Amino acid sequence: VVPFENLQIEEGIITDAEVARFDNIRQGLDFGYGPDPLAFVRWHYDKRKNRIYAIDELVDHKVSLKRTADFVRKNKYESARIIADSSEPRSIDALKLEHGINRIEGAKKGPDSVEHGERWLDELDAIVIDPLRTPNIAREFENIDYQTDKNGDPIPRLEDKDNHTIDATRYAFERDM
Ligand SMILES: [Mn+2]
Ligand SMILES: [Mn+2]
């Protein structure tokens, strides 16, 4: 009935010391469309405790691949791989050939895995989010509900709304499943 019971959300929950130690990065990108924004996400993954930690984000309603590229490079986030929304193959091309993000690549998994990717995140021991670092990830994950069906009963799919960092996280971890 209520998803992501595993959330840990508090301002300051991730210190700068911790961020420095994080050495197992996963990054994802949803591209945005119409009213929907571009969402880049960067996480650290603790496989031995089954937890993920939100390190940084970029959410942008006025979608600019240049600006997204400038941000990734400015912060030195291009040493790590980015798994991107594969519905925009030319946006992926552009980041790579146009803007120098060499380690960007398309989500291999299809639209018949959303449900499973969402379950995988949901079954993590903990999803740790500092709203001072990643406030959009915090808002989305905190407020996202399950879709309800014809009757009004809940179903195993998250709402397809205000879920851009969620999607982006799903892409980021798709090889870890
Ligand atoms: Mn998308
Ligand atoms: Mn989206």
From Swiss-Prot:
Q: Which domain of life is it from?
A: Viruses
Q: Which residues cross the membrane?
A: none
In the UniProt annotation, what is the result of changing residue 176 to N? In isolate Ts10M; temperature-sensitive
Sequence segments annotated as region (Nuclease activity and binding to the portal protein): 1-177
Question: What's the reported outcome of changing residue 164 to A?
Answer: Decreased endonuclease activity
Chain sites annotated for binding Mn(2+) 2: 30, 164, 167
Residues annotated as binding Mn(2+) 1 are 30, 85
Q: What is the effect of changing residue 30 to N?
A: Complete loss of endonuclease activity
Q: What is known of its domains?
A: The N-terminus contains an ATPase domain and the C-terminus contains an endonuclease domain.
Q: Which purpose does this protein serve, as stated in its record?
A: The terminase large subunit acts as an ATP driven molecular motor necessary for viral DNA translocation into empty capsids and as an endonuclease that cuts the viral genome to initiate and to end a packaging reaction. The terminase lies at a unique vertex of the procapsid and is composed of two subunits, a small terminase subunit involved in viral DNA recognition (packaging sequence), and a large terminase subunit possessing endonucleolytic and ATPase activities. Both terminase subunits heterooligomerize and are docked on the portal protein to form the packaging machine.
State how it assembles: Monomer. Interacts with the terminase small subunit; the active complex is probably composed of two decameric ring-shaped terminase small subunit and two monomeric terminase large subunit. Interacts with the portal protein.
What name has this protein been given in UniProt? Terminase, large subunit
Q: Which organism is it from?
A: Bacillus phage SPP1 (Bacteriophage SPP1)
Boundaries of the shown chain within the full protein: 237 to 413 of 422
